[PDB]
Design a protein around this ligand. Sequence first.
Ligand SMILES: Cc1ncc(C)n2nc(CNc3nc(-c4ccccc4)nn3C)nc12
Ligand SMILES: [Mg+2]
Ligand SMILES: [Zn+2]
Length: 313
Amino acid sequence: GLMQFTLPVRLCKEIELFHFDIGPFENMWPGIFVYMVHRSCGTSCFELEKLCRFIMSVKKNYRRVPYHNWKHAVTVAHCMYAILQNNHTLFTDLERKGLLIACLCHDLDHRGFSNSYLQKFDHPLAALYSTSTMEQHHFSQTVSILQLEGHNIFSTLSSSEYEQVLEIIRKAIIATDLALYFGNRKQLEEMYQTGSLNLNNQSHRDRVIGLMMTACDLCSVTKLWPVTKLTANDIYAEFWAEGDEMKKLGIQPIPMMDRDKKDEVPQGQLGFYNAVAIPCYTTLTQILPPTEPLLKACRDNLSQWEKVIRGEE
Ligand SMILES: Cc1ncc(C)n2nc(CNc3nc(-c4ccccc4)nn3C)nc12
Ligand SMILES: [Mg+2]
Ligand SMILES: [Zn+2]
């Protein structure tokens, strides 16, 4: 119980900032996550041995895909850690616990294909779950790992604390379905502006945690430009593989997924920052003012994509 994880000095200082990159050394990512659990939650939250066994099973159930991989899982958990550490007193003991686990688990067993591709291929998961197909699968795999021998990291909670934390994780993982983000952010925008937003209304917290999840999920756009730019190559490598698979089903993919329309990526990134990213971090900043560095970095990256279009980069 006296075994604190510590990080080298550059990582000790830089892990606290929103724009931190967890680096290319896979074997350090588990320790980075435990460090984050220990500071956002406590050395007491999880039995170390159960946590390590859960982490390694979560890792093993992420696939070797260009973007939706173990590195993405730990990156999304780190953004959540930053939001939680900059908003100390706004979140319950169970939310702290649940939300870093939700982020680590949110894309479990992803195959690098959209819900839309599963539906057109007619994948078994598309009959088991007609909306948020992959996200219901991700939650399902989380409950699976939680029920392996020696993996119940929540075993010290009561039946009802346990049920609340699995309910927090389910909603949080479901909210990572970008189709659901637009409606959720519109409602939050309206509630905040008409002054009805109430962080004691459970159905309001839910929406606020959904938006945090979208924020953490999209956080590649809040990094240093060279991280953002190199991550975008991973993002399009998945989309263009799905594009090819659409063409194999005899379907012209949307241009986002057509490797023949590589040229239009800079303009596609503008659409994406304007329609999804900027609105996301704006509304988050309105609700949680200390998350402003995320909006500031996103804006800086929009401006870098604008330079790419002007041939300045
Ligand atoms: C950075 C980032 N993080 C997360 C997600 C989910 N995405 N999704 C995109 C894709 N955005 C996008 N690309 C194109 C496009 C691309 C090439 C040609 C034509 C159009 N249009 N749009 C809207 N970028 C991101
Ligand atoms: Mg996902
Ligand atoms: Zn994700």
